Coordinates of C-alpha atoms and ligand atoms in Angstrom, one line a residue:
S178 CA 53.8 115.3 56.6
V179 CA 56.9 117.8 57.2
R180 CA 58.7 117.1 60.5
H181 CA 61.7 118.7 62.5
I182 CA 64.1 115.9 63.6
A183 CA 66.3 117.6 66.6
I184 CA 69.9 116.2 66.5
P185 CA 70.8 115.7 70.3
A186 CA 73.8 118.0 71.5
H187 CA 76.8 116.9 73.8
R188 CA 75.9 118.6 77.3
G189 CA 79.2 120.4 78.7
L190 CA 81.4 118.4 81.1
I191 CA 81.4 119.7 84.5
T192 CA 84.6 119.4 86.6
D193 CA 86.4 120.0 89.8
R194 CA 88.6 122.9 90.1
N195 CA 91.6 120.2 89.4
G196 CA 89.7 119.1 86.1
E197 CA 88.1 115.9 87.9
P198 CA 84.8 115.0 86.3
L199 CA 81.5 115.6 88.2
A200 CA 79.1 115.5 85.4
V201 CA 79.5 113.8 82.1
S202 CA 77.2 113.1 79.1
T203 CA 77.2 109.4 78.4
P204 CA 76.2 107.9 74.9
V205 CA 73.0 105.9 75.3
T206 CA 70.5 104.2 73.0
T207 CA 66.7 105.2 72.8
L208 CA 64.5 102.6 71.2
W209 CA 61.6 104.2 69.7
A210 CA 59.0 103.1 67.3
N211 CA 56.6 104.1 64.4
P212 CA 53.3 102.7 65.5
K213 CA 52.2 102.7 61.9
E214 CA 54.7 100.4 61.0
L215 CA 54.4 98.3 64.1
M216 CA 50.5 97.9 63.2
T217 CA 51.9 95.8 59.9
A218 CA 53.8 93.4 62.1
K219 CA 51.7 92.4 65.2
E220 CA 52.9 89.0 65.3
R221 CA 56.4 90.3 66.2
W222 CA 54.9 92.3 69.3
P223 CA 55.0 89.7 72.0
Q224 CA 58.9 89.2 71.4
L225 CA 59.6 92.9 71.4
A226 CA 57.4 93.3 74.6
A227 CA 59.3 90.3 76.3
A228 CA 62.7 92.1 75.5
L229 CA 61.4 95.3 77.2
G230 CA 59.8 93.2 80.0
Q231 CA 56.3 94.8 79.5
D232 CA 53.0 92.8 79.6
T233 CA 52.4 91.4 76.3
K234 CA 48.6 92.9 76.6
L235 CA 49.8 96.2 78.0
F236 CA 52.3 96.5 75.1
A237 CA 49.7 95.6 72.5
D238 CA 47.2 98.0 74.0
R239 CA 49.7 100.9 74.1
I240 CA 50.7 100.6 70.3
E241 CA 46.8 100.0 69.5
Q242 CA 45.7 103.3 70.9
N243 CA 48.8 105.3 69.6
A244 CA 48.1 103.6 65.8
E245 CA 47.7 107.1 64.4
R246 CA 51.0 108.5 66.0
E247 CA 54.3 108.4 64.0
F248 CA 56.5 108.6 67.2
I249 CA 56.6 107.0 70.5
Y250 CA 59.5 106.0 72.8
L251 CA 59.7 102.2 73.6
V252 CA 62.5 102.7 76.3
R253 CA 64.1 106.2 76.5
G254 CA 67.8 106.3 77.9
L255 CA 68.3 102.5 77.5
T256 CA 72.1 101.5 77.6
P257 CA 73.7 100.4 74.3
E258 CA 74.5 96.8 73.6
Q259 CA 71.3 95.9 75.5
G260 CA 69.5 98.2 73.0
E261 CA 71.3 96.5 70.2
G262 CA 69.7 93.0 71.7
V263 CA 66.3 94.5 70.6
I264 CA 67.4 95.9 67.3
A265 CA 68.7 92.5 66.9
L266 CA 64.9 91.3 66.5
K267 CA 64.7 93.3 63.3
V268 CA 60.8 94.2 63.8
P269 CA 59.4 96.3 61.5
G270 CA 58.7 100.1 62.9
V271 CA 61.5 99.6 65.8
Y272 CA 64.5 102.0 65.3
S273 CA 67.2 103.7 67.4
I274 CA 68.4 107.2 67.9
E275 CA 71.8 107.9 70.0
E276 CA 71.1 110.0 73.0
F277 CA 73.1 111.4 75.9
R278 CA 72.5 110.8 79.6
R279 CA 74.2 112.3 82.7
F280 CA 76.5 110.3 84.9
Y281 CA 77.8 111.6 88.2
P282 CA 81.1 110.1 89.3
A283 CA 81.3 111.4 92.7
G284 CA 77.6 110.7 93.0
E285 CA 76.2 111.4 96.6
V286 CA 79.7 113.1 97.6
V287 CA 78.6 116.4 95.6
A288 CA 74.9 115.9 94.8
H289 CA 73.7 119.4 95.9
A290 CA 76.3 121.6 94.4
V291 CA 76.4 119.7 90.9
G292 CA 72.5 118.9 90.8
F293 CA 71.2 116.8 88.0
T294 CA 69.4 116.8 84.8
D295 CA 65.6 116.4 84.3
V296 CA 64.3 113.7 81.5
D297 CA 65.2 116.4 78.7
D298 CA 68.7 116.6 79.7
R299 CA 67.8 119.9 81.3
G300 CA 69.6 121.3 84.6
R301 CA 66.8 121.0 87.4
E302 CA 69.0 121.5 90.7
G303 CA 72.5 123.0 91.6
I304 CA 75.1 124.0 89.1
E305 CA 73.3 122.2 86.3
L306 CA 70.2 124.6 86.7
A307 CA 72.3 127.7 87.3
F308 CA 74.7 127.4 84.4
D309 CA 72.0 125.3 82.2
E310 CA 72.3 128.1 79.5
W311 CA 76.0 127.5 79.3
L312 CA 76.2 123.6 79.7
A313 CA 73.1 122.9 77.2
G314 CA 74.7 123.8 73.8
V315 CA 72.6 123.8 70.7
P316 CA 70.6 120.7 69.1
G317 CA 71.0 120.3 65.5
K318 CA 68.1 120.0 63.0
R319 CA 67.1 117.6 60.1
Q320 CA 63.8 118.5 58.2
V321 CA 62.1 115.5 56.8
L322 CA 58.7 114.8 55.0
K323 CA 57.2 111.4 55.8
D324 CA 55.0 108.5 54.2
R325 CA 51.3 107.9 55.0
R326 CA 52.9 104.8 57.3
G327 CA 55.5 107.6 58.9
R328 CA 58.6 106.3 57.1
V329 CA 61.4 108.7 56.1
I330 CA 60.6 109.8 52.6
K331 CA 64.0 111.7 51.7
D332 CA 63.8 115.3 50.6
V333 CA 66.0 116.4 53.6
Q334 CA 67.4 120.0 53.0
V335 CA 70.5 121.2 55.0
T336 CA 71.0 119.0 58.1
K337 CA 72.7 121.1 60.8
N338 CA 75.7 119.7 62.9
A339 CA 74.5 120.7 66.5
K340 CA 76.7 122.8 68.8
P341 CA 77.9 121.1 72.1
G342 CA 77.7 122.8 75.5
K343 CA 81.2 124.3 76.9
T344 CA 82.8 122.6 80.0
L345 CA 82.7 124.3 83.4
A346 CA 85.1 124.1 86.2
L347 CA 83.9 124.5 89.7
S348 CA 85.6 126.2 92.5
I349 CA 84.8 123.0 94.3
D350 CA 88.1 120.8 95.3
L351 CA 86.9 117.1 95.2
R352 CA 89.6 116.2 97.7
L353 CA 88.1 118.9 100.4
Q354 CA 84.6 117.9 99.3
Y355 CA 85.1 114.1 100.2
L356 CA 86.6 115.0 103.6
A357 CA 83.5 117.6 104.4
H358 CA 81.1 115.0 103.3
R359 CA 82.6 112.1 105.4
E360 CA 83.2 114.3 108.5
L361 CA 79.6 115.9 108.3
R362 CA 78.0 112.4 107.8
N363 CA 80.1 110.8 110.8
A364 CA 79.2 114.1 113.0
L365 CA 75.3 113.5 112.4
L366 CA 75.6 109.6 113.2
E367 CA 77.9 110.5 116.4
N368 CA 75.6 113.2 117.6
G369 CA 72.2 111.3 116.3
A370 CA 71.4 114.8 114.3
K371 CA 68.6 114.9 111.6
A372 CA 70.4 117.2 109.1
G373 CA 73.5 119.5 108.6
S374 CA 75.7 121.7 106.2
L375 CA 79.3 122.5 106.0
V376 CA 80.8 125.2 103.6
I377 CA 84.6 125.8 103.2
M378 CA 85.5 129.1 101.5
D379 CA 88.9 130.3 100.2
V380 CA 89.2 133.7 101.9
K381 CA 91.5 135.2 99.3
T382 CA 89.4 134.2 96.0
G383 CA 85.8 134.0 97.3
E384 CA 85.8 130.4 96.0
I385 CA 83.5 127.8 97.7
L386 CA 85.9 124.9 98.0
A387 CA 83.3 122.6 99.8
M388 CA 79.6 122.6 100.2
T389 CA 78.1 119.4 101.6
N390 CA 74.4 118.8 103.3
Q391 CA 73.1 115.8 105.1
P392 CA 71.0 114.2 104.3
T393 CA 72.2 113.6 100.4
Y394 CA 71.2 111.4 97.7
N395 CA 72.6 109.5 94.7
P396 CA 72.0 111.6 91.7
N397 CA 72.7 108.5 89.4
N398 CA 69.8 106.5 91.3
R399 CA 66.8 109.0 92.1
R400 CA 64.3 105.9 92.5
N401 CA 63.5 106.2 96.1
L402 CA 64.2 110.0 96.4
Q403 CA 63.0 111.9 99.5
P404 CA 62.5 115.5 98.6
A405 CA 64.0 116.3 102.0
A406 CA 67.2 114.6 101.0
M407 CA 67.4 116.9 97.7
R408 CA 67.5 120.1 99.7
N409 CA 70.8 122.3 99.1
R410 CA 70.4 123.3 103.0
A411 CA 73.6 125.5 102.9
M412 CA 71.9 127.6 100.3
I413 CA 68.1 127.4 101.3
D414 CA 67.9 126.9 104.8
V415 CA 67.8 130.2 106.8
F416 CA 68.5 130.1 110.5
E417 CA 69.1 132.6 113.3
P418 CA 73.1 132.8 113.6
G419 CA 72.9 133.7 117.1
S420 CA 76.3 133.9 118.9
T421 CA 78.2 133.3 115.5
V422 CA 77.6 137.4 114.8
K423 CA 79.0 138.3 118.0
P424 CA 82.3 139.1 116.0
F425 CA 80.3 141.5 113.8
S426 CA 79.0 143.3 117.0
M427 CA 82.6 143.4 118.4
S428 CA 83.7 144.9 114.9
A429 CA 81.1 147.7 115.1
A430 CA 82.3 148.3 118.9
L431 CA 85.9 148.6 117.8
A432 CA 85.3 151.0 114.8
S433 CA 83.0 153.3 117.0
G434 CA 86.0 154.7 118.8
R435 CA 84.6 153.9 122.0
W436 CA 85.6 150.3 122.7
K437 CA 89.3 148.4 122.8
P438 CA 89.6 145.0 123.8
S439 CA 90.9 145.4 127.2
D440 CA 87.9 147.5 128.1
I441 CA 85.3 146.1 130.5
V442 CA 81.6 145.7 130.9
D443 CA 80.0 144.9 134.2
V444 CA 77.5 142.0 133.5
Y445 CA 76.6 141.1 136.9
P446 CA 74.1 139.6 137.9
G447 CA 74.1 137.9 134.3
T448 CA 70.6 139.2 133.6
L449 CA 69.4 142.7 132.0
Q450 CA 65.8 144.0 132.3
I451 CA 64.7 145.5 129.2
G452 CA 61.3 147.1 130.1
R453 CA 59.3 143.7 130.6
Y454 CA 61.8 141.8 128.4
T455 CA 64.9 140.1 130.2
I456 CA 68.2 139.2 128.5
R457 CA 69.8 136.3 130.1
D458 CA 73.4 134.8 130.2
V459 CA 73.8 130.9 130.4
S460 CA 76.7 131.4 132.9
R461 CA 75.8 134.2 135.5
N462 CA 79.0 134.1 138.0
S463 CA 80.8 137.4 136.3
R464 CA 81.0 141.0 137.0
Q465 CA 83.7 142.5 135.1
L466 CA 84.4 141.2 131.7
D467 CA 86.8 142.5 128.9
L468 CA 85.6 142.2 125.3
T469 CA 87.5 139.0 124.6
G470 CA 85.9 137.7 128.3
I471 CA 82.6 138.6 126.9
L472 CA 82.8 135.9 124.0
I473 CA 84.9 133.4 126.2
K474 CA 82.0 133.7 128.9
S475 CA 79.3 133.5 126.0
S476 CA 77.6 136.8 127.8
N477 CA 74.4 138.1 126.0
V478 CA 74.1 140.7 128.6
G479 CA 77.8 141.8 127.7
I480 CA 77.1 142.3 123.9
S481 CA 73.9 143.9 124.7
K482 CA 75.3 146.6 126.8
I483 CA 78.0 147.4 124.2
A484 CA 75.3 147.5 121.6
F485 CA 73.3 150.0 123.8
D486 CA 76.6 152.3 123.9
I487 CA 77.3 152.1 120.2
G488 CA 73.8 152.0 118.8
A489 CA 72.2 149.1 116.6
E490 CA 72.9 151.2 113.4
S491 CA 76.7 150.6 113.5
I492 CA 76.0 147.0 114.2
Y493 CA 73.4 146.8 111.3
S494 CA 75.7 148.6 108.9
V495 CA 78.5 146.0 109.7
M496 CA 76.3 142.9 109.3
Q497 CA 74.8 144.3 106.0
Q498 CA 78.5 145.2 104.7
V499 CA 79.5 141.4 105.5
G500 CA 76.5 140.2 103.3
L501 CA 74.3 138.9 106.1
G502 CA 70.6 138.9 104.9
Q503 CA 71.9 140.1 101.5
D504 CA 71.7 138.6 97.9
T505 CA 75.0 136.4 97.5
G506 CA 75.0 137.1 93.6
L507 CA 75.3 133.3 92.9
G508 CA 71.8 133.3 91.2
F509 CA 71.0 129.7 91.9
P510 CA 67.1 129.7 91.9
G511 CA 65.5 128.8 95.2
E512 CA 68.8 130.0 97.0
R513 CA 67.2 132.3 100.0
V514 CA 68.5 135.8 100.9
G515 CA 67.3 135.5 104.4
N516 CA 66.4 138.5 106.7
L517 CA 68.6 141.3 108.3
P518 CA 65.8 143.7 109.9
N519 CA 66.1 147.6 109.6
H520 CA 64.6 150.3 111.6
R521 CA 64.5 154.1 111.8
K522 CA 64.5 153.9 115.6
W523 CA 66.2 150.8 116.8
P524 CA 64.4 150.1 120.4
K525 CA 66.4 148.5 123.3
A526 CA 64.9 145.0 122.8
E527 CA 65.7 145.0 118.8
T528 CA 69.2 146.6 119.7
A529 CA 70.2 143.6 122.0
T530 CA 68.6 140.8 119.8
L531 CA 70.4 142.0 116.6
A532 CA 73.7 142.2 118.5
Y533 CA 73.4 138.3 119.8
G534 CA 72.1 137.0 116.4
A535 CA 68.3 136.8 117.3
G536 CA 65.9 138.2 114.9
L537 CA 68.1 138.2 111.8
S538 CA 68.0 134.8 109.6
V539 CA 71.0 134.0 107.3
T540 CA 72.2 130.8 105.2
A541 CA 75.4 129.0 105.9
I542 CA 76.8 130.4 102.6
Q543 CA 76.3 134.0 103.8
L544 CA 77.8 133.1 107.2
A545 CA 80.8 131.6 105.6
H546 CA 81.2 134.5 103.3
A547 CA 81.0 136.9 106.3
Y548 CA 83.7 134.9 108.4
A549 CA 85.7 134.9 104.7
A550 CA 85.6 139.0 104.9
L551 CA 86.7 139.0 108.7
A552 CA 89.7 136.5 108.0
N553 CA 90.6 138.5 104.8
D554 CA 91.6 141.4 107.0
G555 CA 87.9 143.0 106.5
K556 CA 87.8 142.7 102.6
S557 CA 85.0 140.8 101.1
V558 CA 85.8 139.0 97.7
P559 CA 82.7 138.2 95.7
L560 CA 81.5 134.5 96.2
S561 CA 82.1 132.1 93.5
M562 CA 80.9 128.5 92.7
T563 CA 83.2 128.3 89.5
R564 CA 87.1 128.3 89.5
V565 CA 88.5 131.9 89.8
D566 CA 91.7 132.3 87.5
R567 CA 91.7 136.1 87.9
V568 CA 90.2 137.4 91.1
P569 CA 88.1 140.4 91.2
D570 CA 89.0 143.3 93.5
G571 CA 87.4 142.8 97.2
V572 CA 85.4 145.7 98.8
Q573 CA 86.8 146.8 102.3
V574 CA 83.9 145.9 104.5
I575 CA 85.8 146.2 108.1
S576 CA 89.0 148.4 108.5
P577 CA 92.0 146.0 108.4
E578 CA 93.0 147.2 112.1
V579 CA 89.5 146.1 113.3
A580 CA 89.3 142.9 111.4
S581 CA 92.9 142.1 112.8
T582 CA 92.0 142.7 116.3
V583 CA 88.7 140.5 116.0
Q584 CA 90.8 137.9 114.5
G585 CA 93.2 138.1 117.7
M586 CA 90.3 138.0 119.9
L587 CA 88.6 134.8 118.1
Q588 CA 92.1 133.1 118.3
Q589 CA 91.8 133.5 122.1
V590 CA 88.4 132.2 122.2
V591 CA 89.8 129.0 120.4
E592 CA 93.1 129.0 122.6
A593 CA 92.4 130.3 126.0
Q594 CA 90.2 127.5 127.7
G595 CA 91.5 124.3 125.6
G596 CA 89.1 121.2 125.0
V597 CA 85.6 121.9 126.8
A598 CA 88.1 123.9 118.1
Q599 CA 91.9 123.5 118.3
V600 CA 93.8 122.6 115.0
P601 CA 97.1 120.9 116.0
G602 CA 100.2 122.6 114.1
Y603 CA 98.0 125.8 113.3
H604 CA 96.4 128.8 115.1
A605 CA 92.6 128.4 114.3
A606 CA 90.1 131.3 115.0
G607 CA 86.4 130.6 115.6
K608 CA 83.0 131.1 117.3
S609 CA 80.3 128.8 118.6
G610 CA 76.6 129.4 118.3
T611 CA 73.6 127.3 119.5
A612 CA 70.2 128.8 118.8
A613 CA 64.9 121.5 119.1
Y614 CA 68.5 123.1 118.9
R615 CA 70.8 123.9 116.1
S616 CA 74.6 123.6 116.7
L617 CA 76.9 126.3 114.8
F618 CA 80.3 126.7 114.3
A619 CA 82.2 129.4 112.2
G620 CA 85.8 129.9 111.8
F621 CA 89.1 130.4 109.8
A622 CA 92.7 129.3 109.8
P623 CA 95.6 129.7 110.0
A624 CA 95.5 132.8 112.2
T625 CA 99.1 134.2 110.8
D626 CA 97.7 134.2 107.1
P627 CA 94.1 133.1 106.9
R628 CA 93.4 130.8 104.0
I629 CA 90.0 129.0 104.8
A630 CA 86.9 130.1 106.4
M631 CA 84.4 127.3 107.5
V632 CA 80.7 127.0 108.7
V633 CA 79.2 123.9 110.3
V634 CA 75.6 123.7 111.1
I635 CA 74.1 120.7 112.7
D636 CA 70.4 120.5 113.1
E637 CA 68.8 118.7 116.2
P638 CA 71.7 116.7 117.7
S639 CA 70.3 114.1 120.3
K640 CA 73.0 111.8 121.6
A641 CA 74.0 114.8 123.9
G642 CA 77.4 124.5 119.9
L643 CA 80.1 121.6 121.1
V644 CA 78.9 119.1 118.5
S645 CA 79.9 121.5 115.8
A646 CA 83.6 122.4 117.0
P647 CA 85.0 118.9 116.6
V648 CA 83.9 118.7 113.1
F649 CA 85.3 122.1 112.6
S650 CA 88.7 121.0 114.0
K651 CA 88.8 117.7 111.9
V652 CA 87.9 119.1 108.4
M653 CA 90.1 122.3 109.1
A654 CA 93.3 120.1 109.9
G655 CA 92.5 118.0 106.6
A656 CA 91.6 120.9 104.4
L657 CA 94.5 122.8 105.5
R658 CA 96.9 119.8 104.8
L659 CA 95.2 119.0 101.6
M660 CA 96.0 122.5 100.3
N661 CA 99.8 122.1 101.6
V662 CA 99.3 125.1 104.0
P663 CA 102.6 125.4 106.3
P664 CA 101.5 124.7 109.8
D665 CA 101.9 128.3 111.7
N666 CA 102.3 127.2 115.4
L667 CA 106.2 127.8 115.2
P668 CA 108.4 128.7 118.0
Ligands
NEF917 C1 74.6 132.2 121.4 O1 74.2 131.4 120.5 C2 73.9 132.0 122.8 N1 72.8 131.0 123.0 C3 72.0 131.5 123.6 O2 71.9 132.5 124.2 C4 70.6 130.8 123.3 C5 70.7 129.4 124.2 C6 71.0 129.3 125.7 C7 71.2 128.2 126.0 C8 71.4 127.3 125.1 S1 70.7 127.9 123.6 C9 75.4 131.6 123.7 N2 76.3 130.7 122.8 C10 76.5 129.4 123.1 C11 77.6 128.9 122.3 O3 78.5 129.6 121.9 O4 77.7 127.6 122.2 C12 75.6 128.7 124.0 C13 75.6 127.2 124.1 C14 74.8 126.6 124.8 C15 75.2 125.1 125.1 C16 75.9 124.2 124.3 C17 76.0 123.0 124.5 C18 75.5 122.6 125.7 N3 75.7 121.0 126.0 O5 76.4 120.8 126.8 O6 75.4 120.3 125.0 C19 74.8 123.3 126.5 C20 74.7 124.7 126.2 N4 73.9 125.3 127.4 O7 74.5 125.5 128.5 O8 72.8 125.8 127.3 C21 74.5 129.3 124.5 S2 74.9 130.9 125.2
NEF918 C1 80.2 129.6 125.9 O1 79.5 128.8 126.1 C2 81.8 129.1 126.0 N1 81.8 127.9 125.1 C3 81.4 126.8 125.6 O2 82.0 126.5 126.8 C4 80.3 126.1 125.0 C5 81.1 125.4 124.0 C6 80.7 125.5 122.6 C7 81.6 124.6 121.7 C8 82.6 124.2 122.3 S1 82.7 124.6 123.8 C9 82.6 130.2 125.5 N2 82.4 130.4 124.0 C10 83.3 130.2 123.1 C11 83.1 130.3 121.7 O3 82.8 131.2 121.1 O4 83.0 129.3 121.0 C12 84.6 129.5 123.7 C13 85.0 128.3 123.7 C14 86.2 127.8 124.1 C15 87.1 126.5 123.5 C16 88.2 126.3 124.0 C17 88.7 125.0 123.7 C18 88.3 124.4 122.6 N3 89.0 123.3 122.1 O5 88.3 122.1 121.9 O6 90.2 123.3 121.6 C19 87.2 124.7 121.9 C20 86.5 125.9 122.5 N4 85.3 126.4 121.5 O7 84.5 125.8 121.4 O8 85.6 127.5 121.0 C21 85.2 130.1 124.9 S2 84.0 129.3 125.8

């Protein structure tokens, strides 16, 4: 026969933004065998079987029914030294090829972002899949002719070296990723919740600094792996963002020319009839509220009446421009786009629902990206999961004046009240949402020069919006300090 013998390539190293290893190709031994040669040394089979801890008769049966085949694995991806224990038997037809297996040093802490490789050392999930073309490199080649018993008869013509894959530096900071993983895991146990997501973005660069989900898994130990636990929820799970989009409804109002923060809406009696449909506030002891008051009293009635005044088109436009229901450009296969509905004529019911964040569906990544644009004085920088050394130009999606006013309003949402999101030493700005409940918090800090945007989503808390705020407060306090951001609550 003439046979191609592929030479394994070294898969590219994945690191942290700081160069901390997240995915490393480990040298391993792959005991294969040439059945046709084994078939001439059957008295050695029981020993070899015991070494591979297989049943003697199952092993025997395997080799016998593969007697015509020149190639089969005994144990793929065995560790070396153990594999030198079997080569030690000197059993005819039993060989070794040096192979590469992925090790994930940070295991479960960054499982969804980094992902893992299939059996063939090919990317299957997360960055490993999305950058498979970059990380894979090029296998080398031997071309061999073989004996009738499958032995290497030489005439090998022009062995290729094999091209290694390139190293890739993520935008992820492993110090913020650990802090986010630990606080989200603790939040789920405290609040008895099922699942959750936490994204941290750099508002100046578009870099995702942290992306964690619960449940998680150990990518080094995928024995008892729940498909559930493998879900990168931050990028795959769409939800109604609800009240967390009210800052965008306020942005459209402030850009209309018809609204300033001190203008008043009468929300009495805390409900509003739309034909048959009835919009309903949770607290219904308000009459006149200004725009900051509408966010502080969580009035759906107030945001609905402003939306009727400015039109859904202006609200639709801001939401689309900040990337809600829009392709993120990260080209992670399976990443969801969600749904921002569009109409020629926006009826009253759909205008109100859009404005308070019902009837659209977004990902945690999209919402973080939208808060990032708002935090970055209305300028949207492109999302990246890889380290950004040279920052692309942002698109101005909200006017700097409007963005700056909405930042101010969201800082009074966090401050004016106290306890019930506060980040001691820093001015933080944020908005809670509550959509089987989902608890949301979206925010950014510090208010004087925003650095970080963060989204917290918690799925079905039991031990009871206000389950999300304390996670935000704790992760933001830690993230800003890990990034040496100077505290901005100054006299
Ligand atoms: C925006 O998401 C609004 N949510 C709704 O109108 C849908 C719901 C009505 C009642 C509950 S779901 C407004 N935003 C918020 C918010 O900003 O958090 C809420 C919060 C509701 C909430 C949160 C926690 C608790 N709790 O004590 O555990 C109780 C409530 N609640 O009073 O329902 C809803 S209005
Ligand atoms: C609407 O329901 C109000 N929020 C609540 O009282 C329910 C909560 C959700 C999470 C925590 S409280 C108004 N809406 C918002 C908002 O947009 O989130 C706020 C919240 C005020 C507030 C005050 C103090 C603190 N704190 O712990 O330091 C945090 C918040 N906060 O949750 O944003 C105005 S009340």
